[PDB]
Amino acid sequence: NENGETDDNIETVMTQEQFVKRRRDMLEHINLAMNESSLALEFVSLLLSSVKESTGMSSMSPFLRKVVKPSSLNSDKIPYVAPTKKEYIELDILNKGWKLQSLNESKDLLRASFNKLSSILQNEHDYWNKIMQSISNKDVIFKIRDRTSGQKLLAIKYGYEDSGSTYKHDRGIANIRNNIESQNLDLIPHGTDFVHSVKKFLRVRIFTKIESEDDYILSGESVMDRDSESEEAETKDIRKQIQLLKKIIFEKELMYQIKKECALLISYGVSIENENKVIIELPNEKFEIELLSLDDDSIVNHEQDLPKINDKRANLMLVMLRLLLVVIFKKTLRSRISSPHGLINLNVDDDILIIRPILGKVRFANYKLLLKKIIKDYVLDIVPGSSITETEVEREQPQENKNIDDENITKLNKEIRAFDKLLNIPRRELKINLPLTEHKSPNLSLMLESPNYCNALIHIKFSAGTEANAVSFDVEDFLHFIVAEYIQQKKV
Amino acid sequence: FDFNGVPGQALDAVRMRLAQLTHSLRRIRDEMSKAELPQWYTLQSQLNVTLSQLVSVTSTLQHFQETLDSTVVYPLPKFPTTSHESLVTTLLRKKNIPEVDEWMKYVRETSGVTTALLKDEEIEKLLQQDREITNWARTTFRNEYGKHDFKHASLLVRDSKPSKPFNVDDVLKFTFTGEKPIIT
Amino acid sequence: PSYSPTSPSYSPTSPSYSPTSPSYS
Amino acid sequence: MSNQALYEKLEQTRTILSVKLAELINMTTIADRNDDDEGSFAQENSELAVATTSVMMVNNQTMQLIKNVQDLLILTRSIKEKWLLNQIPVTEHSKVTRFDEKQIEELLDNCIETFVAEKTT
Amino acid sequence: GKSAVIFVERATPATLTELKDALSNSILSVRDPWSIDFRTYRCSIKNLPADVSKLMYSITFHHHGRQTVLIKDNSAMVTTAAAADIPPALVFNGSSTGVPESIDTILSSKLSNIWMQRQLIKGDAGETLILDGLTVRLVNLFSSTGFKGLLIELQADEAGEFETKIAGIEGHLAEIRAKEYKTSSDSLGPDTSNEICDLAYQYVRALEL
Amino acid sequence: VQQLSLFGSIGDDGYDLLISTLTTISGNPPLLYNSLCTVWKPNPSYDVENVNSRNQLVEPNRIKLSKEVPFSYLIDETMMDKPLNFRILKSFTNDKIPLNYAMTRNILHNESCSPWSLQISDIPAAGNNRSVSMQTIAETIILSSAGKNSSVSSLMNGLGYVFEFQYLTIGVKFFMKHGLILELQKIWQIEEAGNSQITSGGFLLKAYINVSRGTDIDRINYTETALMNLKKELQGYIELSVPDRQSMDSRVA
Amino acid sequence: PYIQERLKSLNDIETQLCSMLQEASQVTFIFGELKRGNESVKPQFENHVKQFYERLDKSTTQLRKEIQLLDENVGTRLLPINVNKKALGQDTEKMEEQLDLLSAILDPSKSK
Amino acid sequence: MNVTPLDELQWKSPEWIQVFGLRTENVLDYFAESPFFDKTSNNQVIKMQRQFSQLNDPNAFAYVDPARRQILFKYPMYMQLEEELMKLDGTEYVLSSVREPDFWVIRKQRRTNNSGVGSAKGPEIIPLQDYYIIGANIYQSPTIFKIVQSRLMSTSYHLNSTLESLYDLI
């Protein structure tokens, strides 16, 4: 109601000729009275007779050039009597009732269009009732003003998306009501389309090129997130709009996958022409997920159900990759809540950035393939009767999950703990392993470390006996060789 | 001693209020031309609402010497300078009405009267007075609205406020010197 | 004190204040 | 704070009370109220200016009345806004944490990892 | 970690290079330059009689961090002027503003009434020579009164037989004609929970005459 | 460092509310913290002039050693337990934690020492009407100690200072926009003859920003604004004001 | 929320004010007939007239009362303390992230 | 039926042939203005009344003046008429004389101004209450302040209310 009363108090109008002619009316009709008040300033020169009279007189530039003190009077106090006593004067007092009557007629007319003007404002009373209904409790009461000016102009209120932690650019929400009793969702860009216009979900897609190593034939399979193509978000229903707001949250989430795109740019795995980036990794040549440096997931396709083993795995990717940047969205807020400056400006060294989509690629590919290859090299030590085992032991030694210890604070401790158990996933370097012998007893051991998908294998070995002898060394070519040297210094 | 002290007793008083309604109109006239932007709907009502008030004081200032001035009725005789360029004198000394007088007729004719004389006219006066007396009835109804009220200091403070746990300044004084906070 | 200078506008081209009738003989 | 906000509303109300009365009472004076009695103190003397009272009354009283209303409709919807500003709503299942909250989650993540990542053990 | 400091009192700018080469064979690598500021604060206190002491020494190292050791009457205090080196917890609960400056700055500017800076020796563009189980540092010491002498800093991981390492280097000094030199590994007595402080400290022993 | 600040207070009554409010304005929870401050004065037995070797008029001042006490050395009851600082402060009102604070000044419970925040402040900026309290602070961090007499007390004596008085403060702080901090705090005098809460009745409210510059009029002027915005935004709820300069002068007194 | 009731009580007081206008508008045109000498509806004039007074006095008590109530709500910890509209976005959203993605990662791992 | 009322035009060219050059000017004004009602003309007619010879019988050392007349001072034949006019209209008191309905003039070069008045006299003061009319090129002006104001004043306001009516903008 207040906003709408303020709108009527903003002079505002978009009229061509209509708006134009009216303001010209003001100019001339106001100017008239301005100019006639200047005859009033001419009566001022009419005084003359005094110096303060001259002051008043200079009122006309023509008085500046018409020197005279000019005028003189006599007495008709009798004529004052005639003005007052005349039958004409009695009658003229009737011109007082007459003009005053027509003024009262005007008054009545103005007054009535006023209650009908309050009736267009009841459209708004209803809109506020509509807003009272629907989206409520926890939710944005963002109050905004646009169309510039800074005062008056256009002003209203609503919620938006990013909040705690900072993606950074073009992130928010803005909401208004149509005459169909439905709410239209503005975004301050992401340009309106009641509960959106066009929506892009993040999407995913994983290909494998095998052919049993036959013709370089690659197929994909994609974990699909489609609630439906049919849209409801009913008019007059903010509850359905709350659902549309949840859709809006998902759209804001895709913006996060844009940061992951950029975080790819720090790696050697596909980004082609600077116009499209493709996620892909060497082994069995396979590909996992995508979204063009142009965008992510934009909706228009045929709809059939068939699945595929690639497809099942692919849904696992999206949730991880998605999840992984909630982590980022979390360790950002750790710093913010925790220390003064704030976190702003996001992932220097692409250390913070890299986590998203960088550690997943690493994880899958590196530790795993390299461990497999280490195992073949450990088959070069496959020769002795022997034995040799792997643990989470390196993993156990650092980066504990859900520990009671906490940090500085009770409030701080909780969030730190939340980070930790999810932190396993983000930390995913290879654990490492060992092998041993007894009978006057010897012992050796190796650790696989991924540092950014590059693989180090650092080993150890001690032969425990009456007098102690030992060596430790920290590349895969040398590892093969070290194993050959170990055979000689072992039993054989 | 040669020529005369003619008139203009409250003339200065008219001039002052003549000017203020000129001054407030003139300024609105200057802005009225920058139709590029209107001054803020508050601003124009501040200037055009005290600019209308200016003409109330200028309206009344006319009646207050109103017996005196119609009686004075000065028409000019002057320097011959006034005679050359002529009109300025016809213009500057002329009272009439504009196209204005006409909606004055529209209004006069809008009333229920015109040529029916004195006895019937005196009666209409008593009748309009009766309308004003039926307007007093507004006084009676205003009593019903019955709305007039007010917004011992100590009596009211107990209800209202107990605010302050201590002296801010003294607290600090202590932290810095070990001077200890005394009763405030 | 009141403003500063006094706003000219002086005018003989206005609507009109004089009528006309006392000619014919 | 609240006090200052209200004071304005009270003033607006007082203004709205004092002007339909001036429209009524000034109606008497506008209609012209020349008194044979010497005591009565309302004036309508000169031509232009006594019917000018009628032109001023129109704009003054009628817009002060309607204006008190426009400002008081602002006042109304202002308080509404104040109330739609909202308060801090606390959690509904607070003290009773929902979802697989715990290390239990550490297990969940390991499952996904082995699932998505390869090797068959 | 063990340590010793050698000061060549009677010397010139060139003495450094003489010893630099007499060791040119016994080298492994040479790391980035180091620096050191050595201040002498004369106390301003007359009320305390000649029965107990005066004088405090202030040693600023550029050992990665702008850290400063104060020494008076065989007691050593360790400070930092580097914002990064602040204990995290002090910053969080507001104890620290996180804006430190040099303890010396404070001394000379805020407690200047109690302490007057008497002497200021600096050692610029020092050289870091790396051997096996013995890091050897070298620098020329300058006052506001000219060259003062040459300085040798000996830091070693190996608590094992540091005694031989010291003796060997003193040999090289006899060769290059380095006569009237002063040496310190402390005096059997202090205890190390933070050894670096003590080592940095000895300097004083070598530069008191 | 330059510390620009505004002060005020609330009774324990207002705390619960103020909290809910402050959390929303800042968007961060309050974070529980504490600190002990030990003040030292020049040894009254020694005596020194007010001039340097560089003829400078230099006045004697107090030194302030500050650091955190882990709450384990501060808190009365586990039953209260919990993580929440405001409900917990009512538990703390009127009276002391274990304290006896002397013990820690010289170790106990053969020893080296902790890190300290060693500070010395000047009276807030002379100003006819300041919009904000602007105060200079000289600080150094002590990292650890060495030598015969390595207890913090010995060290201070060696430098020619004497222990004067001490106090503990516990509160919550809000981390906010452009280095703005809000502390809602309680203060306790610590003496050997028992501990009393200086802030008994409520909380000392401190909103501040430490600025690295001083000589960047711009960032200084920006800082003024920040604090102003706060006082302003909370106007009609709580007045943040400039404390009397005279009340923030740690000089001889 | 349950205050949407108190909100509608004020929006109705708003309709009461639009009646202060609507009613006194008749008072305007009706006093028009009255000074016109035609004493025709003088009783009816009095009626809609005390009615404009009545509507605004009811509105005056009703919004004045509503302001008293808002001050009372402000005094209560039910309404947010004295001050300003600011971000709630950060809170629930940040945590809830997990709850949806975690619940969904549970869902695609085993089902039905 | 319409009136020229609060002074209008002249009577022009009609005694421009008879010729206007002061003194005669006053009489020309008489015909023109349609405003000589009693005394001046009456004085004119009584002398003008004799029309050769019916029967019509009924009774019916220099420098001294009025204060305004002393200020005015008359030059030529109109000065002689002035004596006649005093004679026509003079209520007499001890050191004083008052007039009834005389019409008279004050002038310069191309134009003048004339009044029709009543004088009240005394030793140290004397005032004439009258109507005043200015007269340039066959036109007469008769005007009133307060009437003068109501003029462009009501005009200012009606035009301001046009302005206020135009505030019918959003």
Side-chain angles (χ1 to χ4, degrees), chain A residues 62, chain C residues 5-10 17:
Chain C
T6 55
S7 308
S9 179
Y10 273 39
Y17 296 93

Side-chain angles (χ1 to χ4, degrees), chain F residues 40 44 47 62 65 83 89 125 144 157 159 236 245:
Chain F
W40 308 71
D47 282 328
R62 302 172 164 78
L65 264 41
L89 261 69
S144 58
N157 284 176
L159 277 41
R245 301 204 311 134

